[PDB]
Symmetry: D2
Subunit: 471 residues, 4 copies
């Protein structure tokens, strides 16, 4: 079975009866709730459907709350939608108005103040392109250079224009509050551009008295310029290639992806690769050769998880998309699970020990690597190494099973909080012997710590045969 994790986005196409169930059964490891779209009713109903499916199948499924961030958007049109034809003049104003074809508002109130002639405007992640002709008082006069359809509240991008906007919008803070109370397992922040952006997320979490892992979505030059600092301050990163591929030259993204995955793994942080991996499966039952390649290469790059956006959220083949993504990952890993080596020898106790654990497992042809983890840290230093051996995280904290759903190669087991290392090993034997696949005598390598239930306490490797008296 598969090692690389699959993130799916919920929306209209995953609202049909028991479709969230179908996704989980097909291999969805993480469910992305995109707070750009939908009502709190829609989110609640979706989150419910995931918990049921997770608990009914016994498949771990993390729930990821994606916060819109300071996204810039067009206003409302009198018509709901217009057609912007190559050669037409369009005014985009910071003034209040009901838009029409040639004059519409935007959410960014600093547009008049920050946009200068020659500035480019990409709509809907690149399809309709304008150039700024003039800024007259409150209006921004543009010429459509690539033509197409625009609708109410369609998103835009002003590449290289310096955008002043709080890391968390007032709407994001309410979405974050709603999501923390609802019981989501992780939070993703759009348009991160500083390591300090996590402090503001944390501030809100502390008010509400609930912290979850915070994913930095990489889709801004400032993010890549500060990749290292951000990967260290945040708990995971997403290569958000849609916005990244308009905010940077689209031809720069491939190497930024590769460099960001390598940075994540060096620091034992989850990395998701996102957006258009199987874009064509929105309309078609099979993907393009490019798409198949893109997914295979994300695996060999060393990505913890690949994500589907529109493929599952609004697509015609959300199921086929997940199944297809699964087959491709499996095809690659059958050949080899190998990842690009780390460019540093581990220095932290948990890194050194997890590295050693992998070594002993592989060299002794063990049936499993088992790590005990309170925060998931010890497990994440073993995942990044990419062994072909099963990696089994043992934890007393159910949320950590949901958190590790986006960590490479990792199945998690909830067990009572133990007061001894011998107890942890009895737990392993107990848990593992329930599965047909493990038998008494089978050799496994166990990583553990003392004093138990203490983070960073991990200090022990035990080569154990299941059920034998070797403790």
């Amino acid at each position: 079975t598969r090692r690389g994790k699959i993130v799916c986005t919920l929306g209209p196409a995953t609202q049909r009866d028991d479709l969230v169930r179908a996704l989980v059964e097909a291999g969805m490891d993480v469910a992305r709730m995109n707070f750009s779209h939908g009502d709190y009713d829609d989110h609640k109903v979706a989150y419910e459907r995931v918990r049921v499916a997770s608990d009914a199948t016994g498949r771990a499924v993390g729930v990821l709350a994606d916060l819109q961030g300071p996204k810039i958007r067009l206003g409302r049109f009198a018509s709901g939608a217009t057609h912007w034809a190559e050669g037409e003049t369009v005014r985009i104003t910071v003034g209040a108005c009901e838009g029409s074809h040639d004059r519409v508002s935007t959410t960014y109130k600093r547009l008049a103040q920050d946009a200068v002639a020659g500035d480019r405007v990409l709509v809907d992640d690149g399809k309709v392109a304008l150039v700024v002709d003039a800024v007259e008082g409150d209006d921004v006069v543009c010429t459509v250079v690539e033509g197409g359809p625009v609708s109410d509240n369609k998103g835009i991008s002003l590449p290289g224009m310096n955008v002043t906007a709080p890391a968390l919008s007032e709407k994001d803070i309410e979405d974050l509050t709603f999501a923390l109370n609802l019981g989501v397992d992780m939070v993703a922040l759009s348009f991160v551009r500083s390591p300090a952006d996590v402090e503001l997320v944390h501030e809100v979490m502390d008010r509400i008295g609930r912290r979850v892992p915070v994913i930095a979505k990489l889709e801004k030059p400032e993010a890549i310029d500060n990749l290292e600092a951000i990967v260290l301050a945040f708990d995971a990163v997403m290569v958000a290639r849609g916005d990244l591929g308009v905010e940077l030259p689209l031809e720069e993204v491939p190497l930024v992806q590769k460099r960001a995955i390598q940075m994540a793994r060096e620091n034992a942080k989850p990395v998701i690769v996102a957006t258009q991996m199987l874009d064509s499966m929105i309309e078609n039952s099979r993907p393009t050769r490019a798409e198949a390649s893109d997914v295979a290469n994300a695996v060999l790059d060393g990505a913890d998880a690949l994500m589907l956006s529109g493929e599952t959220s609004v697509g015609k083949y959300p199921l086929a998309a997940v199944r297809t993504m699964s087959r491709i990952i499996c095809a690659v890993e059958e050949n080899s699970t190998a990842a690009p080596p780390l460019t540093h020898i581990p220095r932290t106790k948990r890194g050194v020990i997890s590295y050693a654990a992998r070594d002993i497992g592989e060299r002794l042809d063990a049936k499993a690597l088992v790590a005990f983890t309170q925060s998931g840290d010890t497990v994440r230093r073993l995942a990044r190494l990419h062994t072909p051996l099963p990696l089994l995280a043992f934890t007393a904290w159910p949320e950590v099973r949901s958190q590790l759903a986006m960590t490479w190669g990792t199945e998690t087991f909830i067990v009572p909080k133990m007061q001894s290392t011998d107890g942890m090993i009895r737990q392993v034997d107990k848990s593992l012997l329930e599965l047909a696949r493990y038998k008494r005598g089978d050799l496994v390598v166990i990583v553990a710590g003392a004093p138990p239930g203490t983070v960073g306490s991990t200090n022990l490797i035990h080569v154990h045969r299941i059920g034998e008296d070797d403790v």
Copy 2:
């Protein structure tokens, strides 16, 4: 400037006035003439337009004749086109008939004899899918399992069904004859499945008294099963991912590509990667993030050349497609031109010397590597290594400049046939000093042979400063 070579396919969208010129000016290195489509008038007019553009710009442009091979195709419909809806019964007969919705002919006259119930039928490279229910005398009854439109003479694929059909069809032999007389520089054969398939191509070439380099298109299991033998018998290979991705599981293609590129380079043969690299640019001015990734990864894989099929042949943005492909390749090579190392130390005189030549060039920060070549062999053993140094092929045979248009990193220079090594070096000085970019004193490494104008005679490396008395 760019090292990786770009192959474009000519068709309706590259027939508009001076568009073939625009392609060459935008960076087209090889022009594919696809003999699946078009009249001999259409091909002649296109081939003319390429020679003019090549000669008018002084950009080398190879002309590649792609032979349809034993492609299986549907017959004619009374309507020209029908709609095959998920759930419908369709008869495909080896009998002669004008088709309608529920009964149509195919070109494969062995279909009744070779198709068994449960066999799958993919149309138009996968979009419409049938399953074989029954073979009733001459008719093959199928159920549409994925629905869509079919037209006259649309191509089909019977994956894993053993197809008996000659390597060269009677139509291919006439297309090959036409193409050799027209003056094409290389020939590509569809659906190669044995190393001996090249003997039949050669046979025809010998009758006509004209041999060109023969590209094996890899798009059949038998091809990959015999990859090594084929790469040795043929002069180049194309990873033809369209048909390969229906004839094999589409999830297997990514690693077959990688393994086929590595096999090409080990044996100093050109490899093209083909089909759907920028598929979405048929309709759109920018590609998908998957597409951008697919192209970048073909470069890092070590592909001599990337190809555009429908992107240039029938697409709306043939120019943007070439420009976009060029930017992506350039983005990757700016970072590094490095390729996956070879798994063998060179053993052949030309391999050893070209390897050594690269070493001396790079270590001495030379301005250029220069190799003299009659067949292009000596040059191709340097190309596969992927140095960031300019690689300048010197030849007396104009066709060889067109042949090396699909070899990595290589610009070619036509010079008189020399009778001495000192003559070859004077030639270099003269040719190079015409370009602004080279000046007297500039350090350059020259590979040459004696007796001159003899293939495999290469036996000499000379570290030369341009215009200085060091011979």
Copy 3:
């Protein structure tokens, strides 16, 4: 302090009052009792003096019983000693007789029937050389080719002559019996030439109901031809360079040494390098530059132990010899303790775990590696790796401390037989805290097993801070 172990040979020069004490205080790790020389009184008195010095200093000192083996020797001369002058004819007979200058006996009674004209005879490890002229019935007439003095019972070598003689002589069996009852810790067998030679040693040990580790002395072509098999059947090996350098071309010995050390370490067996390492210190207070080099190079070769023969046994500077050898080893190890890498990844549980233990220790800058061992095996798989970290063997079997005296880099600690892993760790804390060098908080890596007091049970690594509650 020093990692490489020093073996000293006892004889006349180490019989002086307190000399054996002085040797131990100067760094003697193993005391060789050479059963070629001395009577049982001399051996007893020497063995007593070693146990006292070991127990009085608390320095581990192994006692090695070196068995003469089937050594070929000259008979008795009427004069005790004669002079064999270059050019003289000498008869060496298998017949019984009192030795005249020109006619003497030998112990080898197969000489007449095994010696053919042209055969060479080296005396006293090479200094006087003869050639065989004629074999007359029972006499072997030779011509002195290199001249010098010979005495009663002087040893000879017939290089390349096939010698039929039991692996254990009648006198060896009595020396072995005497040595096992006396309480020696290891046994060395001279002139091993088959892996089965250890079976005959074991046979005697089983009769007497006492087994000790058996060292194969390598000093015969048959030994080197069977190096691997011998290293696997025996518990250690000695490169016995004196006899090896007359039985083989002396110019072959340097690489045989290197290849025999590498073979020992691959299979986790002790290797001693022996004979003439500091030969000139028999007469002189400082060695030759060659001698200094020879010792340094034995260290970099990866030798567990270097031996002194005549330097301590009959020499004028037994003390200086040990001190000097110690300074040289220390000089080398100060720079680096690094050894030639192993040509195989460990496959045995104990190899894999000890390798991993080293890794964790070095990477975490631990103060010590600690291994619990019943047979010393687990410790010996860590020793061969040559870490700069102190290596501390913990055992309940006092003999094992004496056995590990000849294992690289290893100090041993006797502790009560423990019934738990937590017990072993409390033991470590207690033993180590007695030494000034270790304090509470100091980081150490502990290797252990369960069920305890079982050989090959080793299955556990524990990163422990001394005195802290982390078990």
Copy 4:
């Protein structure tokens, strides 16, 4: 045949009738004339005997003039010799006197001024050792701590005492003058301690209008402290282990040797390893196991040349010593000629090209590497690499054949000064075809330059079959 070069020292034992001839015939590559001993008659007669033997055998033999340097020596004794017994008081004065047992002069006039109580005095390279008790006006009162015999003008060492003495003594300048006029090929300077010491040697050479290569003898801490600068300013280095092993701790010498050989080879300079390699062969026909080891290890260290001092100069077996040294080197090289890799990629034109030349040779199983050289530089960058292929230097300067006698693996060929590269290749064919060993067709790799007869002009590699038309 052998690659590593053998330096022999001439003296009383090489004055017997055509003994110098016997040495050359046995493999002496360089003859050391030690100007510490002998008068100019003795040197002339010896130098004559070497030129005759070299010319009569056609074996290249370099002649090395070793200059005594600022060696500190005892004065004359009334008796010619006394015995200094452990426990005796000895006065060593800077005042003029005919010595006796209690009171003797020295050459060092700064002894009273520079020697303080507690200072150690080694005599005759270590055998008799004193400690300084008091300095009374002009006298240095010492206690014999190690006893033995001393004679007229015996050499002493004051380790760690700062010695003020010119790099060239007045006696050295006259020996250097005599040696340059006599026609010696190289000059060795004792007790180098600064890179500028070569400037003073050069100064004298320039006055006399003759420069030869200057060997820095390494035997002082200041030398090792400045190893790199010295190796760059001087043309070769000798590890002079006799004095180095009293001026430094003798236990430090082994690693200084290794580090000095590595430094020589990195900068393409010859390194000789000197003194006591086979010390025991002064008295004995076979060496010690240490001695055999010392020679083998000098080879694997990467030494261009091993030297014999007393073994040939005063020894009883000068011939056996050379033969024995030869067998050991040959034994090692049979197994492998491999040297410790260089820690830098070559950067100079001649380094890069010679590296490349080796590559092409080895990979194509060439019969020889051939390099054309004016100064020997191009050859010396190939030698340091240690290929198992024959290395044949071609030069028009006969002295360069004598100079390359101490460069690893190198046979030299004198040829007319050529005006073309094609000429150099004709020369090779001609010279090589005279030897039975080379035949027409045999492939060889040739390194050359233009304009010819210019140092550092080397810029060409040619893969040539002997006698074939491939130029």
